[PDB]
Symmetry: D2
């Protein structure tokens, strides 16, 4: 039962699924849906109202075509931006989406004080750093980072070791994308570190086999439906609710922070999600922390190449 308002910037497949999740799963009361496409946010709103009627959930929804109409939002999830084309470099996408994130931030800044901005737009860590510059102290800027990569990794462990999903813990950290890495020291099954759980059950599964299965599963979703829709919508709800309901759940998110020897970079580490956000680098071992620093340097390199 939370009396706050959550705004959705871009009500495409991911945006609309996220809005549906908020409507039917316990938690949220007020919603703001925004999309540039005329009539799209309105239609997505009317359908979700019918679904709330089914679950007998009393919700209040507003739909607009202009981002400037968003005011007094407690959480703002941004799915807007252009997808990465096969030809484009990570620098080319950063340049295209940097202006998009800047223009959205500029229109929301003054009307939404104290709001948690959740950037989904890619490259997610670089985009979080762009929105964080624009917003500053007027709110809290975060990115989804490796939050979904973490749930996809746990789901592959659960499948490969024949254990229920509830039994698996562990995090995917660093730079979201192809370079995101498993923090193997945090990976447990019913609280038993994964190396001991495997050898004690004669399981013929290696770390490389788990990592390839995650990539293969992600690629099968991309090939058949064009993008991941259901998993990311669930993760935004988990991030937003943990923040607004002060749940203090550990979730890796892209968060601007001071990284030893690298500086202020948005990178994913296991973070406490509550009223305030607290990154816990100490949950990573000395080796994993050294790899996290390389990720932060890579993120900054892309950020400093923005024209």
């Amino acid at each position: 039962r939370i009396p706050y308002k959550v705004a959705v910037i871009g009500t495409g497949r991911v945006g609309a699924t996220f809005a549906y999740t908020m409507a039917v799963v316990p938690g949220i009361a007020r919603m703001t849906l925004v999309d540039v496409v005329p009539g799209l946010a309105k239609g997505v709103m009317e359908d979700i109202k019918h679904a709330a009627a089914v679950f007998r959930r009393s919700i209040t929804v507003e739909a607009f075509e202009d981002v400037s109409k968003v005011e007094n939002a407690d959480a703002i999830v941004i799915t807007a931006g252009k997808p990465r084309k096969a030809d484009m470099s990570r620098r080319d996408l950063a340049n295209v989406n940097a202006q998009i994130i800047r223009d959205i931030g500029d229109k929301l800044r003054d009307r939404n004080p104290g709001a948690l901005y959740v950037v989904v737009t890619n490259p997610v860590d670089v985009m979080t750093m762009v929105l964080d510059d624009v917003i500053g102290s007027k709110g809290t800027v975060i990115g989804t980072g490796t939050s979904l990569d973490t749930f996809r990794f746990r789901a592959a462990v659960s499948e490969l070791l024949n254990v229920p999903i509830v039994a698996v813990d562990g995090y995917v950290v660093g730079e979201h994308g192809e370079e995101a890495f498993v923090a193997w020291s945090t990976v447990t099954i019913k609280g038993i570190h994964i190396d001991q759980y495997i050898k004690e059950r004669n399981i013929n599964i290696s770390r490389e086999q788990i990592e390839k299965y995650v990539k293969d599963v992600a690629a099968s979703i991309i090939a058949s439906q064009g993008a991941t829709i259901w998993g990311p919508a669930a993760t935004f709800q988990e991030i937003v609710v943990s923040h607004l309901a002060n749940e203090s759940k550990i979730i890796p998110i892209s968060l601007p922070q001071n990284i030893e020897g690298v500086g202020r970079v948005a990178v994913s580490v296991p973070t406490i999600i509550s009223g305030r956000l607290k990154p816990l680098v100490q949950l990573l071992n000395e080796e994993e922390q050294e790899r996290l620093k390389r990720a932060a340097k890579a993120i900054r390199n892309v950020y400093e190449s923005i024209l």
Copy 2:
């Protein structure tokens, strides 16, 4: 609720995939079977919803197939397959789609509840019922969404909470679906009395027009309804498998006085057995129901 049963989803396009997601993230169901003829589609939907179940910490089992013949021992089967034109032409093309699905599911799914979503839904319900017979229970979504869409309209126009509204849309799903105004109440007070005592100054006609304008806005923007229908499948399937005995208007093959056996929508008890309650309608609503029942039979007779 927490039930140990398996639900199959035949057709994992936008609607079926939303239903599968709903099952993965809300309490109730933990076993599901996803089917789609399009290569890799059902598998893709399955891997993605498993990622959402991991977020919600819900231990579920999902299987995905490309052949409907692989569905076995399902307790409920939601059918979203078929073409999305007149009611007669749509009936002939989709009747054969439903008959084929029926023949491949019948023997390997004993006692399963079949939920026909394929349009014209009352007609497709009759088609499957003939194929399935006594080997399972066949129903259609009928006017269940129409009902919630109407309540959503009343809640918004009267500025009352959604949980305060009761009432049913009945008959033939589509343009001839009608509000059973005798059943429409606000916190147990008949709607006419509620509006008059409070000087709300809204006509039954303005509410009905509002429903149509809202429905039109959904089509022009996303092509079809998605979220509302998926929520209704969850409601129906769970009320049946958990023996909840909720009253929901659904398309049910029933004997209609002076018409015969026809699948038409009336407020129905949704439990292990399904029981239509024509007596919830007044004399005049019952005459219109007989007329809707004839209209469905006519379309059925044209296949």
Copy 3:
């Protein structure tokens, strides 16, 4: 979810359990707790507020020592021979009703006091058009019966349907025509699988279980608290679930009487006598005549 106020008159084991249920499961916006014992309702409220904090549920609870303090509630739950107990409890129920009647317009009154059918009629007489009066009737009996079926037939609870109807107490009867297992009539299910279990063994099992609860706990608590919550929420959220409850209705050959039949629980309450076969309707008529005999003896 539900923006209404529910009052609980009497916060003993049952009442306090019901209050806890409303706070942690469906989520209620407002709760009013009443108990004549000084400090009792107040302490239950403080403890339940701590449970709401654990579950991160926004609830607002008020506690009183006098029934006259209950105002604007949307639902109100009211927690030797059966003839003499009727004369004694009729005055208690009339006094509670007189205190609440004009301060709680449109409220659903839920009578738990025994004899529940007779008490439902007595409170209905006081309230009249100022709210809706119902009694718990055979709602718990139905869920107790289903749990016995699930146990003896080794089937999940969710597979069982069926109703216990009539007069709450020794005379309540199973409407066996409504009893199904995954929609299969219980007689057919048992035959097809060769289960050596009789209707008589099931009815006796139900009684032995209830006697064992009284012997160990002193009273039934968890089942009743769950049942009150199910009834109140179905009425306030217009869920239209079928639950047998004591409802003042017209019975053929009897007239006005509160008796238990499978009833539609929504904004309006619709009793469904036609779910019963002819023989069950004839036993039901006998239950209604016995209730009316008791009602007529207490004005």
Copy 4:
């Protein structure tokens, strides 16, 4: 959540039965063992709780026992407090024998189980059981978990803010000495001091702490015992552990505190498969009070036998 694991409830008095009712009617757990030495007591509770499951349409499996040795393959074991039945050192010595006997009878048939201790003094009783169970499972105490939720509820009631808006921890040694970690207390992310200051609210830290104490005195005075709050906390801790939720809750957990050594103390802890105490969440001043709270617990523990 939807977990396939089994939770055992040792002692099915008011608290035990309430915890078993919570598991039965809310999503998460569907398998439970109820244990009570009083003949027919656990059975009666089970039968009544099964009736509540029928109402909520939750297919659950419950087993009732009179003997503790009958508990097998439990993933979580909640040892509820017995009858209060006088002096501090003597109570700790008499209760330690009770906890040791229960531990000895559960250890071998419940490998890797989480043991939840309620029996006072909770911190010392968590250490006593930890010695018994050892590597065969994970031993925790309730510590200041409920004290934290009671403190949060008082902040909510006094400042007139939604309960969901309040963050903050009560830490140290459970009881009279339990102290508020004021540096962790926030309202929608804003520190309580700055929140109260900017809105000119006539509420001090002393008034809040006094209110929490007064409220807990009114529960004891009327109900005789806290029931609903503790039962809700067991559900929260057990589900966070069994579903690897990683919620931060202060619990009594054996750990190393410099200057003290091995001690069970309540610090904000990650509740997951593994439990990790987060002492760094407290500031320099709260950390020195905690080291002093640890010395007190360690001194009572070193007085046993």
